[PDB]
Amino acid sequence: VRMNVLADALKSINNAEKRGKRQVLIRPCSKVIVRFLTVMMKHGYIGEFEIIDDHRAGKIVVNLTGRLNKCGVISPRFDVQLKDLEKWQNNLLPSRQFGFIVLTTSAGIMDHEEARRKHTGGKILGFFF
Amino acid sequence: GRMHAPGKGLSQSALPYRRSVPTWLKLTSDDVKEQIYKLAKKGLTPSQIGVILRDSHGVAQVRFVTGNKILRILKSKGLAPDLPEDLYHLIKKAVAVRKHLERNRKDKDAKFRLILIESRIHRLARYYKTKRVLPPNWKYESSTASALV
Amino acid sequence: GKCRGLRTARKLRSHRRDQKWHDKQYKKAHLGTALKANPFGGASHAKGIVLEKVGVEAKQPNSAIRKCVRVQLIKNGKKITAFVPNDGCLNFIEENDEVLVAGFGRKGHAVGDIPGVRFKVVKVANVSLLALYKGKKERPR
Amino acid sequence: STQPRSKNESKEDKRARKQAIKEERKERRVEKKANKLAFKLEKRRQEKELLNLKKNVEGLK
Amino acid sequence: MKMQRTIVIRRDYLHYIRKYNRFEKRHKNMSVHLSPCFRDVQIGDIVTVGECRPLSKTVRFNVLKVTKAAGTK
RNA sequence: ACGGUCGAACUUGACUAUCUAGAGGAAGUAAAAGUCGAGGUUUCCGUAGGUGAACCUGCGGAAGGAUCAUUAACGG
RNA sequence: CAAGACGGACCAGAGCGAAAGCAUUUGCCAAGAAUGUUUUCAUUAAUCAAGAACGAAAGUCGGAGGUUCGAAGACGAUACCGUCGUAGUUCCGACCAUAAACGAUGCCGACCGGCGAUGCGGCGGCGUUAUUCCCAUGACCCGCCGGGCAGCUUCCGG
């Protein structure tokens, strides 16, 4: 059955970006998916997206830009300190200049640099470059 | 993906976006409530009540009209069965399969389908015992099955 | 696939235990039935009393007659076959001399030409074969 | 007993022939099992003692 | 609740295995002294116990508070 | 000195386990050249039988075995 | 005339079943997938240790029947082949639980090219047929949707 809707959203975005598409439809929508997409969006990766509101769980249409190489989810949500973050960074990111490990912390869903800025650890969610 | 079958189909109902009651339906919520009451006093399940109301009375969705679904309406007035509809129908099917097995000994297909049906019965009974619908001592037995029907 | 859940540590640890038990190096080291069969008993060297001298025929591609010593170990009474290099050195071993024997080099595996031998003679009469081959010492009788 | 069955065969005579056949099969299977066990014993003894022959007593001097 | 003035409770915790960075469910059974002042106490509710001197061979804690089950009226 | 208690140990049986001296039994190799008189090539799987093995055969299964030609209708 | 056997051709890129498997007519029994659904419940689900049900053929216990075929076996020729033929092959009730039991290829879910064939269900439509059938319905024709069995094509990627 469908477990981890964010895994499906990221897999569909990655598969559509590999095919060179300009728009992708992901269903169902959720809060975590919209937060993750906003985290990509403020860094200039997925342009801007529509949320289609049925009375069920929603749908999202994302306008791809070609800038994404890979977006990925980490399952299960491991617990990340502020001292294990470097080890995660070297494991998951291609270089020290770009790419994004995404955490969920008590200050919201955000990336690793702003997590280090806010002095909070959290749970791992993804990475995109 | 069916739970006890290898098939998997898409046959279901697609509710519309508009939750509003259409203007051509002149029935009120209360009138639908006594329609439900008189359809339940003759011995109908809530699903049969909803089908009859949809096909002839124009009640597309009773919970959009009245505000409550049929089982809660019947439970408010006390016209609800002591065991729910789907468990009752699974028990009745199990009783029919057991009777056929008693009359026909060499039907191993019937034995297989009976095991599947009673596994469904135990899963649904476990769910209902969790949600305090059934008593915590409720138990489905082979020999005392038809007494529940 | 393999279980990935956050509470799956017991299954991962149990499976890695039971699958470690399939690597024959691990099972050789930990089962203990390979040290109860080892004539050296987990030791690097062992001393023994020479029973006889034997001529071990080499394998099929190399036609020769290598020459070894059949020696009974002092510490446990097990009889083994040790390799003395040459007739240069074989004539330094007489019957009933006390020889210090090592493994041959492949950690319990056989010589590349002669079969059934895993050991080589290092010392005879408490003096080395290298100092006798090179004439640096003589052995007492 | 290689006797072809007759078309006018009666009761208590067919049953005796069938019982004889099943009993014959029974001790035939029993002595086949005994022969197999004896051959297994001989094979294991030969394997162990040939391994002994390759262990020691092999050489010229 | 099968003993005289003594009950058996079960504490469930989640032990951390650090090679795999994972967890495993563990439990500990615990014999505690149930005072007769706690009437209408039944299997499945949450007891808060405090440590005292050894009361028996296996009893070292004593029931202080009882909170009913998640659905029990 | 009676009694109690802790209790090393001793003796007798059964269960075992080890070390030892062992008649005898059944054996491999070195020496005895003393004695008498094969065959399969389609390949397998599961069973059962044939002198034990091999191999053959019975029943069921597989290809992991080398697809040419005729053929839409054309009678209502 | 009788006895038991077995259901050819139709019979397929077909269908059904959890698999093993399933083909003469009619009647009875209870299941079932897919479809259709502006029905009902509201997370009741996915996977399997333990455990349980079925499981080709051969084989084993007991009853019945032995048509054909036929292990072993008896003859004749040259392991091959022929004649005869026991157990078995058949039915009933218990054991056995093994196959190249195959897609040599876990199960559930998502995404990722195209085409048109086919089985079933639903929908829309010119039209032809039940000797220009006097409206509907079955049989065809075109197109669409859903779940299927199964092909061809592709520098998707591997």
Place this chain on the structure above:
RNA sequence: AAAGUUGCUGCAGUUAAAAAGCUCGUAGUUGGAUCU
């Protein structure tokens, strides 16, 4: 340590070693969307 030949990071299971004959099934593992 080489050994990503014990693999959590991080291996494999058509043809090379390898997926249970099939289904049900407790324990365990995992579990849709929704509340400033």
Place this chain on the structure above:
RNA sequence: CGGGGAAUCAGGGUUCGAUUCCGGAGAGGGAGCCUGAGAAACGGCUACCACAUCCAAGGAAGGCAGCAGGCGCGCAAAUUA
């Protein structure tokens, strides 16, 4: 014997820790005591078991897993200063 710890070390790990620090246990094997604040003490005592010393044959005495040292065992380890 456990731990502090040691080797290796991209990251994760794998292996080791008899051994000078801390804690435990034992003084050939068990058991029971006396004294004392503190021992079930063994460079204290009393038995039994296994060893072993001296003897005028009646008796007496013992415990190096302390420091040296010896024998044995072994592939394997120092001076009776």
